[PDB]
């Protein structure tokens, strides 16, 4: 071949030595456009400002907005020092696209993007959050000005339906996928950055927004995107449940849609990190208080089923951080709360209702048992010591029977029969279990004498 | 107020056949007969449903991937999805989608273990409305399949069997639980004189409509035996109270009391 | 094209393929001959279906709705009893393969039948004759009527002397040596004697040599015909006569 080797070589080449830095020079860019009736940055946005408010029902794929999108989207003690010398320059630039009206064309481009996934509407989200990133509130307090204005409802009326499809794991095409839920990722953490620092006449405006006419809630919304993906970790749990050793694949898309669930918990705690209670009212009403039941069931049991050994523990960290900010929207859900009030009480409800569920996470929390066992029994200069001398020890020193068969499987069975101790320490996890002797206590503090949760 | 875990439940179905509104119960004896038939209910009044086999108490809800793995080896709220195994109330053998033809479809009738396939049944709603990981609503529109076969539950022109058409199951509850010491309705028991009362033996030439009480004999025996029926083919197994209609159908002829 | 791919199904989809086709596009049989004596298209419909539903197979669970659809049973009969006819044939074939005991071949039959009309090469049956050839590859798997209907189907090996499908054919003889009265499958040997008298047609003698390692497993029961095998043996040696595929034919002699 001769002519082949040379298309190849377009092609490698382009893979290998053209991906490179040279594509770090928007800040000579952007500073370009912000030079010296408006600067020409501003002339450029206010431009898709027009072209977004065009009525093109179908909104365009746009190869112009979509690259000055990513232009603007990457011109974004001692270490607190030059914290707040980054902030400051992080400050000066994300006002550099706010005092400028990007603030506003971004809202008003994923009004036009509607129901569309096209590609373009992720890049806008792109700029939409570094914009905000650090929650400046600058720009969170003028894209409200923004929407109260306009009333316009195509805004939600676009977010809805975005999130209605959106993605999800779906397990059906796993199979098919073995032999884009960033845009998700992503956006939930749009939303999340609407509402980082606390704005409650913004917080609530995701609660009903009173000027449009038509009053979508995003909350309820937002949830079911959740429940959504409830089904599908629940139904991931059930398909590897049979075969103890993870694909892959399997462990490494399973994390991609942890990513996303992490993203979600957040997003539903700045909606309600604010004591902004009526936004939590609704989120009580939920069938979010079914979505915390079956994660529980995950967390039951893919916890459990992840503690076996070393390959699994990338996984399992990444499943604690899940159920670590779980509780933390579960927990402030309640911040601001009467002794028997309402919102606690059905927290109340579901650890009940999730008996079983609940129960096995807490006997992932026996481990110190973590520690101290072996120094009964311990002989052989290298903290080994063998399973069944490691199981006759724990017959007093007392954990429950059959809990302790588990403990050898989720050791190592490391050299034939031997187990250290100080590598069966791991669980890190306990943020969790912190969060959750908070939040048991924060549930007898504020609700006692219900004895079933006592 | 939604379908559940141990809540006692029948397929109530509906039908417009002829001119009569004709809903009905799906049930069967089960001992004598595992094939299951129609016990129709729009006459609820002058002829009385057999109330007493068509009671499906619910074991488990295991969501369908879920339901495929139990198979490879708690009160819970059911949702739009999960297969669900139905026990009868009587034989308690499980339904399911047995093999036989009655047109090519399966028919309906009872196993003798909650193992196998044929025992579970997913539940897909119709409506546009309903949907998946909603908490089933009583009453609602739903479409039972067997996982044995994926047929749908079919009311067949009348009997019922498996087949790939549709049909719209309804599904009331009967009661969820029960408060112990307490009389729910659709319950069989003896009505103590303070001594209990009865009927004749069989072959009398009564024909066993003679009603009496007895003390001794009796007593244990089974003829002593009655179910009381509230007038309801919905919530017949809320907790008895006194002051509303209830037939009382004796057990052992079968006849109701008058 | 959409679940048969190379071979085996790619279940992945053929299982939802085929619950869709169970669900909604609902006497399959007399059909077919109503269709014949008539149109036809539909039963090309039918067939196509059928060659669908074949290309698929917990799924011995699917294997066995589809089961739900052994009612043909001996279509591939009533197709056969239509001689435009036999693409059908090959697609109720291929769908008993898949689906669906050596019992079953004396009522299999009767497209070896056919083939006698297609040894004289010389409707659409003549356009369609090339199709019936390729219904030769297809099969490849009291004891009387299994001699009667051996005798038939070694019948058909002589019509085997389109040709790479006749290579197939003589798979299929020697299928008909490693499957196997034995003695009655010696008859047909010694018309594959006769065969050899022909061979000294080179494609012949390899059916001698099939007819060899018949005459190896003769051998094992042998350690009557045999008279006329040692006629044909003798015949070997004119066949050493005659004179590379000579010297493996030779081998096959020894």
Request: contains cysteine.
């Amino acid at each position: 071949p001769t002519h082949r080797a040379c298309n190849m070589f377009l092609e490698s080449y382009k893979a290998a030595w053209i991906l490179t830095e040279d594509h770090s020079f928007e800040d000579r860019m952007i500073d370009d456009l912000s030079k010296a009736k408006p600067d020409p940055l501003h002339q450029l946005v206010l431009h898709f400002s027009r072209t977004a408010l065009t009525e093109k029902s179908k909104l365009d794929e746009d190869y112009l907005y979509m690259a000055y999108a990513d232009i603007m989207a990457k011109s974004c003690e001692v270490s607190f020092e030059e914290k707040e010398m980054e902030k400051q320059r992080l400050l000066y630039q994300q006002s550099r696209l706010h005092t400028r009206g990007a603030a506003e064309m971004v809202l008003q481009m994923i009004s036009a993007c509607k129901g569309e996934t096209g590609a373009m509407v992720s890049s806008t989200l792109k700029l939409g959050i570094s914009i905000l990133n650090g929650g400046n509130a600058e720009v969170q307090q003028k894209m409200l000005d923004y929407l109260k204005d306009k009333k316009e409802v195509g805004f939600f009326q676009s977010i809805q339906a975005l999130m209605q499809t959106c993605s999800v794991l779906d397990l059906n095409a796993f199979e098919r996928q073995n032999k884009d839920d960033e845009f998700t990722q992503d956006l939930f953490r749009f939303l999340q950055l609407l509402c980082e620092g606390h704005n409650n006449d913004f917080q609530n405006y995701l609660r009903t927004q009173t000027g449009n006419t038509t009053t979508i809630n995003i909350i309820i919304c937002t949830v079911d995107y959740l429940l959504r993906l409830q089904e599908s970790i629940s139904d991931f749990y059930w398909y590897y449940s049979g075969k103890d050793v993870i694909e892959e694949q399997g462990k490494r898309n399973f994390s991609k849609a942890m990513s996303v669930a992490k993203q979600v918990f957040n997003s539903l705690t700045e909606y309600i990190q604010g004591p902004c209670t009526g936004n939590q009212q609704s989120l009580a009403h939920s069938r979010l208080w079914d979505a915390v039941v079956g994660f529980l069931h995950v967390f039951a049991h893919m916890m459990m089923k992840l503690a076996q050994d070393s390959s699994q523990i990338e996984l399992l960290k990444e499943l604690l951080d899940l159920q670590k900010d779980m509780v933390v929207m579960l927990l402030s859900l309640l911040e601001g709360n009467v002794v028997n009030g309402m919102i606690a009480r059905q927290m109340v409800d579901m650890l009940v209702e999730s008996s079983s569920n609940v129960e096995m996470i807490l006997k992932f929390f026996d481990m110190i048992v973590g520690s101290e066992a072996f120094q009964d029994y311990v002989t052989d200069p290298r903290g080994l010591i063998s399973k069944k001398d490691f199981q006759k020890a724990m017959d007093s020193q007392q954990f429950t029977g059959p809990e302790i068969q588990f403990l050898l499987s989720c050791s190592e069975a490391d050299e034939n029969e031997m187990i250290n101790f100080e590598e069966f320490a791991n669980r890190p996890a306990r943020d969790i279990g912190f969060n959750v002797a908070v939040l048991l206590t924060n549930l007898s503090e504020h609700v006692p004498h219900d004895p079933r949760l006592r | 107020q939604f379908l559940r875990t141990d809540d006692e439940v029948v397929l109530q179905c509906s039908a417009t056949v002829l001119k009569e509104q004709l809903k009905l119960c799906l049930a069967a004896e089960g001992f004598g007969n595992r094939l299951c038939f129609l016990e129709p209910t729009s006459n609820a009044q002058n002829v009385p449903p057999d109330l007493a086999i068509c009671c499906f108490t619910l074991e488990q809800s295991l969501s369908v991937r879920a339901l495929q793995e139990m198979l490879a080896n708690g009160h819970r709220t059911l949702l739009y999805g999960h297969a669900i195994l139905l026990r009868h109330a009587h034989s308690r053998m499980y339904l399911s989608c047995l093999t036989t033809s009655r047109k090519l479809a399966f028919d309906v009738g009872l196993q003798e273990d909650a193992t196998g396939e044929a025992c579970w049944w997913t539940m897909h709603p119709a409506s546009k409305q309903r949907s998946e990981g909603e908490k089933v609503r009583v009453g609602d529109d739903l479409i039972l399949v067997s996982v044995s076969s994926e047929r749908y539950l079919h009311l067949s022109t009348l009997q019922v069997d498996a087949s790939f058409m549709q049909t719209l199951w309804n599904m009331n509850p009967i009661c969820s639980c029960c408060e112990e010491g307490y009389v729910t309705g659709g319950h069989v028991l003896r009505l103590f004189h303070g001594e209990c009362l009865t009927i004749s033996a069989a072959d009398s030439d009564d024909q066993r409509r003679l009603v009496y009480y007895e003390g001794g004999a009796v007593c244990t025996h089974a003829r002593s035996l009655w179910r009381l029926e509230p007038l309801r083919i919905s919530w017949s197994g809320s907790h008895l109270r006194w002051g509303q209609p209830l037939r009382i159908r004796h057990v052992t002829t079968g006849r109701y009391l008058a | 094209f959409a679940v048969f791919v190379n071979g085996e199904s790619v279940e992945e989809n053929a299982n939802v393929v085929v619950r869709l086709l169970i669900r909604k596009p609902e006497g399959l049989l007399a059909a077919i001959e109503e269709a014949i004596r008539i149109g036809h298209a539909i039963m090309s419909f039918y067939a196509a279906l059928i060659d669908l539903l074949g290309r698929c197979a917990e799924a011995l669970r699917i294997r066995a709705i589809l089961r739900s659809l052994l009612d043909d049973l001996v279509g591939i009969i009533s197709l056969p009893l239509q001689i435009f006819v036999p693409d059908h044939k090959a697609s109720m074939v291929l769908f008993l393969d898949r689906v669906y005991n050596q019992d079953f071949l004396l009522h299999v039959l009767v497209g070896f039948l056919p083939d006698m009309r297609a040894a004289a090469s010389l409707t659409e049956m003549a356009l369609a004759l090339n199709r019936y050839l390729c219904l030769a590859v297809l099969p490849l798997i009291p004891l009387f009527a299994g001699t009667e209907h051996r005798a038939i189907m070694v019948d058909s090996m002589l019509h085997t002397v389109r040709g790479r499908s006749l290579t197939k054919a003589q798979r299929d003889v020697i299928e008909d040596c490693l499957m196997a009265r034995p003695s009655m499958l010696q008859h047909l040997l010694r018309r594959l004697v006769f065969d050899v008298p022909i061979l000294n047609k080179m494609p012949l003698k390899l059916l001698t040599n099939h007819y060899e390692r018949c005459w190896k497993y003769y051998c094992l029961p042998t350690g009557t015909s045999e008279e006329e095998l040692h006629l044909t043996r003798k015949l070997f040696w004119g066949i050493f006569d005659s004179l590379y595929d000579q010297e493996l034919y030779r081998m096959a002699m020894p």
